[PDB]
Amino acid sequence: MRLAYVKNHEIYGEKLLGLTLRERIEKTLQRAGFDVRFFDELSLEEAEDYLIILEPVLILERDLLLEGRKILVSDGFTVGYFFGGDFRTVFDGNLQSSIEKYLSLNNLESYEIWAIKLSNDNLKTAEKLLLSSLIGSGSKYARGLFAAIFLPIARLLADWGVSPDAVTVVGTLGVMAGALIFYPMGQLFWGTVVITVFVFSDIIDGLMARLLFREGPWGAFLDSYLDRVGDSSVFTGIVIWFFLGGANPTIAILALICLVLSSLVSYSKARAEGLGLTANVGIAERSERLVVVLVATGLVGLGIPSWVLLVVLIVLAIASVVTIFQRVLTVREQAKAWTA
Amino acid sequence: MRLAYVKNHEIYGEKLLGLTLRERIEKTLQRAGFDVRFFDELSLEEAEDYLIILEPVLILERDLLLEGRKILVSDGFTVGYFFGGDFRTVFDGNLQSSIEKYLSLNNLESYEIWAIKLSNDNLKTAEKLLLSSLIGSGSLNKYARGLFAAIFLPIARLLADWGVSPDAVTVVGTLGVMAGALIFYPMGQLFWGTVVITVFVFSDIIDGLMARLLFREGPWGAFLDSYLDRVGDSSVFTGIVIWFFLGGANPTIAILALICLVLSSLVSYSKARAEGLGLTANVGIAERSERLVVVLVATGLVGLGIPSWVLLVVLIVLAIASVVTIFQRVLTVREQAKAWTA
Ligand SMILES: [Mg+2]
Ligand SMILES: [Mg+2]
Ligand SMILES: [Mg+2]
Ligand SMILES: [Mg+2]
């Protein structure tokens, strides 16, 4: 059993991005496999590991792995100590004496972590940093600019108490509204701007789920599922429009083939992960495919010749096919390697 | 190291459903984590576990779990003995004496297994039983089940003798379905397309049987079956959609087919992704073969000239069933996740 004692502070009560700093550090430490005890004055319990944080601190590092005794530091600051169970036979109720004694007794290296010391003045800074910590793998210059463009939305939704599931669902309904209503009507441009607007909700729900500590398998599932639904709806709309009012059967056929191939490309990865093996490899990514399809469709909606769309649909189809082939090949390799 | 000694016989060399009985028992014992030694006369080696099979026997039980010393029996028959390492200090070179002495020394309980004693006369029977043990059929009458196994015995024999792999069967079958769906249907031949698809559809059951029979049960097999099954169904709906959007001149049917295509993809993806996440969802009102049956029968009927609204109705009902299936799966995985946090 691992125990972590954190000292109470005045600033731990402040609310940051929907949680308090106290609950946030507590849940953070919980993610590290520690049972958290808040203390004004320490009463030690029998256990194996002891992680002692004194000064108020915001830990920005996502995965913290603590193995063996050591000292926790950020930019010259000492944020906390990690002592083993032996320290229970040391601590006499005086802090510095027991610390310096355990340090004279034990030789410990220094471990670098991503953290910021809390102060009343730098809270804004802390918030900014916290926002920056959520990112990746993202777009690195572009990533920095990126955090800047999606930071206010995440901040706003976090402050209003909006859940990420709500965001995912609303976004998908928006995409469905653009794809299944405007497109069959023959409005390709406005449909495209609606879809494009409500598509970034995937990245939004990821930031909010990460920010609010909710995460989980359900979260991952929902993002993936609704993402699939979204793409399928987009292609469905294209297919419908060009089969009827668009009066272009060949585009409609290519779009339909792309719909099916998309479903199959997603299903390959999903089913593979289901068998316990893995396949992340493919040339075609959801956002890139989305981008080319949306840009082409929008262009055609502004009057660009439809053969551009024909070409892009051909290329996307072929890319989906070779991606499928790649995935099937690597899962084959994995299986045959697993049997041996 | 675990050792299993099986005594050599004249009939072990005979080939049954593509393998010899000898290789079959050896590979069976290999699946149990045993190193197999075939012997005309026993030479014992130092080891931990000793599994001794004397009489020629075809073991029909799939998973055999052996923990601790015990006696192996099938329907009153005693098929073999399981002795520990101590038996190395017993065997003096006589078989019967050391076995009966060790049986007099040690009290071992009796474990029931599914197996059949080999004889020259009953070979046909054995073949039948093995076949019957390998094939599943969902919700089939025991008469219907017997009949079904009876109709696939010649097929299994033929494919086993010709050297055809189960992968070959799955792929060929899927190509057949695709040939029916993406060629005949867009041409406007719904009936013949339907008969092509219906003919090449049973290949799923065939590849399951062959993969089980030839002992290739691995993760690759499951992957390939699932994937090509998805490809097949998607191709079927794709064909329907294409035909009815252009020459079939029925936009509402085409739309219903497209919606069903998407919902099908989503219903499958739900299960695949759920399993990927480590949770499970086997629950839904709709099963693949039943859906296949109603769709194919309706489409074929329309292809023989029956009015297309029948197909419209069946597509609506199938759509709704897919939707509620989606609800069940999403709801239960939600329940599981929320239950997992608690
Ligand atoms: Mg998302
Ligand atoms: Mg996503
Ligand atoms: Mg099969
Ligand atoms: Mg199958």
Author numbering:
A (entry chain A): -137 to 1, 4 to 204
B (entry chain D): -137 to 204
Provide the publication's sentences verbatim.
In the initial step, phosphatidylinositol-phosphate (PIP) synthases generate PIP using L-myo-inositol-1-phosphate (inositol phosphate) as the acceptor alcohol and CDP-DAG as the donor substrate; subsequently, the terminal phosphate is removed by an as-yet-unidentified phosphatase to yield PI4. All (class I) CDP-APs are integral membrane enzymes that catalyse the transfer of a substituted phosphate group from a CDP-linked donor, CDP-DAG for PI and PIP biosynthesis, to an acceptor alcohol to generate a phosphodiester-linked product. We have determined the crystal structures of PIP synthase from Renibacterium salmoninarum, in the apo form and with bound CDP-DAG to 2.5 and 3.6 Å resolution, respectively. RsPIPS adopts a homodimeric architecture similar to those previously observed in Af2299 and AfDIPP synthase, with each protomer possessing six TM helices surrounding a large polar cavity.
Subsequently, we determined the structure of a construct containing the complete RsPIPS sequence (absent the initiating methionine; RsPIPS-FL) in complex with CDP-DAG at 3.6 Å resolution, again by molecular replacement, in this instance using RsPIPS-Δ6N as search model. In contrast, although crystals of RsPIPS-FL only diffracted to lower resolution (3.6 Å), a structure of the complex with CDP-DAG was obtained readily. The structure of the complex of CDP-DAG bound to RsPIPS-FL revealed strong density for CDP, with the nucleotide ring wedged between TMs 2 and 3, and the diphosphate moiety coordinated by a bound magnesium ion that also interacts with conserved aspartate residues of the CDP-AP signature sequence. In all four protomers in the asymmetric unit, density was also observed for the acyl chains of the CDP-DAG, which lie against the TM region in a groove formed by JM1, TM2 and TM5. This groove is entirely absent in the two previous structures of CDP-APs, which have a small, hydrophilic pocket in this location, consistent with their preference for soluble donor moieties such as CDP-glycerol and CDP-inositol. A unique feature of the structure of RsPIPS when compared with Af2299 and AfDIPP synthase is the presence of a hydrophobic crevice between JM1, TM2 and TM5, which in the structure of RsPIPS-FL accommodates the lipid substrate. This groove is directly exposed to the bulk lipid, providing a pathway for lateral diffusion of CDP-DAG into the active site. The nucleotide is wedged between TM2 and TM3 in a pocket, which is also lined by TM1. The CDP interacts with residues from the signature sequence on TM2 and TM3. In addition, D29 and T32, part of a conserved P(D/N)xx(T/S) motif at the start of TM1, form hydrogen bonds with polar substituents of the pyrimidine ring.
